[PDB]
Symmetry: none
Subunit: 26 residues, 21 copies
Amino acid sequence: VSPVIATLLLILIAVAAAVLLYTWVS
Amino acid sequence: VSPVIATLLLILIAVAAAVLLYTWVS
Amino acid sequence: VSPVIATLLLILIAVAAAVLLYTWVS
Amino acid sequence: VSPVIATLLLILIAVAAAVLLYTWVS
Amino acid sequence: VSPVIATLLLILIAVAAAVLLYTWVS
Amino acid sequence: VSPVIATLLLILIAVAAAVLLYTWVS
Amino acid sequence: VSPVIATLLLILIAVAAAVLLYTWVS
Amino acid sequence: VSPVIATLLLILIAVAAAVLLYTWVS
Amino acid sequence: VSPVIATLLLILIAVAAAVLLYTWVS
Amino acid sequence: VSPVIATLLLILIAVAAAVLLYTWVS
Amino acid sequence: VSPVIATLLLILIAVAAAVLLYTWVS
Amino acid sequence: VSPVIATLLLILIAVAAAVLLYTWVS
Amino acid sequence: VSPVIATLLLILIAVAAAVLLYTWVS
Amino acid sequence: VSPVIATLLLILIAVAAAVLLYTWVS
Amino acid sequence: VSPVIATLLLILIAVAAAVLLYTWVS
Amino acid sequence: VSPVIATLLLILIAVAAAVLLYTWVS
Amino acid sequence: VSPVIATLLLILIAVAAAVLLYTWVS
Amino acid sequence: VSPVIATLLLILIAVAAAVLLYTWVS
Amino acid sequence: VSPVIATLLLILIAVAAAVLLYTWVS
Amino acid sequence: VSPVIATLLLILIAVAAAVLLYTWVS
Amino acid sequence: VSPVIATLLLILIAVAAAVLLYTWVS
């Protein structure tokens, strides 16, 4: 069940990036 | 037990593709 | 790990619907 | 690697059913 | 993705309990 | 290559039984 | 031990076909 | 060493038939 | 597909433990 | 081609025994 | 060299019979 | 079908090791 | 039935090698 | 050339008897 | 019983060759 | 005991021919 | 010792004929 | 056709011994 | 019919020797 | 032509004795 | 009955020579 690990990685990056945006908008 | 490897490959692609979609919808 | 995607979909709908209600109550 | 498919089926049902419960509790 | 359900349960209890405290302090 | 079929049977039973347990624990 | 090769072939086809179905259901 | 050829024939049939069953059970 | 069950077990423990920490920090 | 039958027997036993071990380890 | 023919006959029967048994055991 | 058992062993180790890493990164 | 033993040997090597690759790709 | 006939008779018996033994050993 | 040896030789070659093909297909 | 030599010759041909057929069927 | 030659002739024919039968049965 | 019996005996021993080795390697 | 005995002797030696070779090749 | 009868007698004994030896060697 | 002895001699040579050929062909 490795794929699950990777599938969660890019997602976490999507969040971190999303955070670096919600700060630019605010 | 090679088939198992391939059977998991296309699936991983289905996930990667699914991710490239969940971002288009969001 | 597809199920996770679907399991989150209906939930998001439950939220959107919940929002369309919290506005009716307010 | 078919078993894996079935083993994931009933599980998905356990989730769907769980959802039909988390709504009854809320 | 069941764990997520449980992980949110005890947390909700931590909130309910926290509320039963913020009223005792006020 | 029959043995392979049987060897997979009891295993599938071990899974089904395991599922009937992961539900008792949860 | 040729039969083993063939016996695994149709099975692999059963998987590929199964995959072309798990996508139709999802 | 002909017998060996025949002895393997019916066996292969037992497999093919077994496959036409493992699909009915699944 | 048993490994998946175990792989999720220790993880759930990591969460429970994490919760027993997020309460100590708060 | 009898030997082949016996040669496969003890092997099947090695599998059954192996299974009675993979359960003790898990 | 006729005997050789007969000596192989009963043996083939021993195989056919053995097959009608390996199916009863399986 | 022993190889299958071993082929799954090292993989399980790859997971356990992967877990001992996902904790170091987090 | 020796050939069967050898025929399975190189195959096992193909798996071990395949594993030493699935780790390089991941 | 009669002797040849007899000389082959007892031999055939030695085979039949040998067969009634190879079955007891197997 | 020499023929048996040769009859098994070319067959083993058919397997080795078959293996050099199952790798080209995979 | 020459006949024995010839009697085995055509038989070997029957095998070689049989092999050139078991490949056409497979 | 001519008779011996003839006595072996018809026998060889009995073999050739027997072969033309073992092929019809197989 | 006795030799055939013996020629198969030592071979069977080579298999049994081979099995007592494939277990030491595994 | 003595010659037949000798003619079979050297042949048996050719087999034993052949066996001491099929083991060197394997 | 009596001598011929006797000359064949001792020979037949040489065969019978030879048989009582080929069994001791085998 | 001497001729019989000689008549069998050259024949035995024909066999020995035949053997020195069946080995060249094999």
